[PDB]
Amino acid sequence: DLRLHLLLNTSVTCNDGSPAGYYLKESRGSRRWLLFLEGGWYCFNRENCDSRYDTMRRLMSSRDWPRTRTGTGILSSQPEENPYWWNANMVFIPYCSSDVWSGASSKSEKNEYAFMGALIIQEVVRELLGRGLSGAKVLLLAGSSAGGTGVLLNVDRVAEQLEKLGYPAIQVRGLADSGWFLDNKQYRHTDCVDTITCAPTEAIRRGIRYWNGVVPERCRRQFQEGEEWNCFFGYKVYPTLRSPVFVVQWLFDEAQLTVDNVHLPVQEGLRLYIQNLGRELRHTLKDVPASFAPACLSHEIIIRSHWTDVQVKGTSLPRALHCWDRSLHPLKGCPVHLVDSCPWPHCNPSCPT
Numbered sequence: 001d002l003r004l005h006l007l008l009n010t011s012v013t014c015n016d017g018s019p020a021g022y023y024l025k026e027s028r029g030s031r032r033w034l035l036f037l038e039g040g041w042y043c044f045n046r047e048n049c050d051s052r053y054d055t056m057r058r059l060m061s062s063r064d065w066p067r068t069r070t071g072t073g074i075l076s077s078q079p080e081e082n083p084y085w086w087n088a089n090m091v092f093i094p095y096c097s098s099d100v101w102s103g104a105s106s107k108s109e110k111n112e113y114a115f116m117g118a119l120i121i122q123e124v125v126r127e128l129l130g131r132g133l134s135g136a137k138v139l140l141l142a143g144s145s146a147g148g149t150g151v152l153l154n155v156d157r158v159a160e161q162l163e164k165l166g167y168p169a170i171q172v173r174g175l176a177d178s179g180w181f182l183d184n185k186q187y188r189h190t191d192c193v194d195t196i197t198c199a200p201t202e203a204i205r206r207g208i209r210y211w212n213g214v215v216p217e218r219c220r221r222q223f224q225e226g227e228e229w230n231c232f233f234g235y236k237v238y239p240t241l242r243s244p245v246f247v248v249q250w251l252f253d254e255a256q257l258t259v260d261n262v263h264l265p266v267q268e269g270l271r272l273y274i275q276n277l278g279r280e281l282r283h284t285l286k287d288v289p290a291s292f293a294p295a296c297l298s299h300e301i302i303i304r305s306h307w308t309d310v311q312v313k314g315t316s317l318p319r320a321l322h323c324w325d326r327s328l329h330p331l332k333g334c335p336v337h338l339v340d341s342c343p344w345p346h347c348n349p350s351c352p353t
């Protein structure tokens with residue numbers, strides 16, 4: 001079990017002003033640290049943030065958080081369930097800022113909600129240095145869904161912060177799970193008139209203004225003011241990063257099909273759309289040396305207990321991550337770039353059921 005610690009700096013808060021926090025399980029015999037970012041969509045205006053506060057309050061507030069949580073998947077401490085990093089120090093950071101981990105704004109007389117996702121990550125790092133993170137050799141910043149996108153937005157700032165605090169020996173790396181999205185054409189098209197019909201590029205554009213969102217500077221300098229929404233899309237922000245990042249992405253991600261207005265007897269027009277989506281995602285990973293991209297229709301995520309079962313070209317994700325570790329000290333029979341090439345959902349027999 002991982003135990004809850006609320007942040008001692010109570011100015012760093014969830015959406016409703018309650019303090020943010022983290023769940024920790026230490027491993028005294030390890031200099032490896034894994035910091036995982038929870039996901040779960042976002043909100044970008046007053047109407048749909050109020051709605052999220054009614055029926056998804058744990059993603060906006062800490063007042064009902066439990067004292068402990070069980071580590072699963074890559075956060076498990078049993079080698080049977082986690083062949084990769086079972087002996088590492090484990091940290092689970094709840095997602096209570098609804099800003100794709102990008103915000104830096106407090107609740108005030110002009111803001112009903114606080115959006116502090118970027119500052120939450122930095123304060124967790126600062127308070128963990130007193131918990132033994134000061135002795136680390138590798139800090140792996142991982143995340144799923146909106147947390148996977150948050151890895152891409154924040155991994156270089158974490159490396160930046162540890163350098164200016166005087167810890168240059170800590171190697172910072174990233175693992176982005178199911179947060180690599182495309183700003184493609186929708187299958188059926190709707191103008192941004194309400195939350196349902198607003199495409200991701202439009203919603204992110206308004207979110208950044210509503211959140212006071214921040215993006216990596218090198219990406220910020222390419223796209224500049226008014227256009228920072230481009231940095232939320234993995235294939236645009238990844239080439240600007242300096243830290244090593246491993247990318248996990250289904251070729252037919254369910255969240256991607258949702259924002260494309262696809263809801264699954266497939267006729268020709270939809271078949272070509274789905275097949276073209278798989279091609280485009282494969283194409284964006286072509287220059288990504290560390291990646292895992294199975295041809296599955298799925299919403300599953302690397303903290304699930306059976307994450308070891310899926311294979312690409314005969315290699316599992318825990319093995320690919322171990323190969324990545326070795327490559328950061330090409331390897332015989334221990335590959336790191338694993339992208340399916342078959343064109344339809346579940347053509348890989350090991351896809352989740």
Ligand SMILES: OCc1cn(-c2ccc(Cl)c(Cl)c2)nn1
Binds near residue numbers: 040041042100146149
């Ligand atoms: O849980 C699924 C999910 C997906 N997203 C998400 C995050 C960023 C972008 Cl740019 C898009 Cl298009 C979608 N956030 N949560």
Ligand SMILES: *[C@@H]1O[C@H](CO)[C@@H](O)[C@H](O)[C@H]1NC(C)=O
Binds near residue numbers: 011012119123
């Ligand atoms: C608390 O966090 C805020 C926001 O990140 C920061 O500006 C401030 O310096 C922190 N205060 C202390 C005492 O660490």
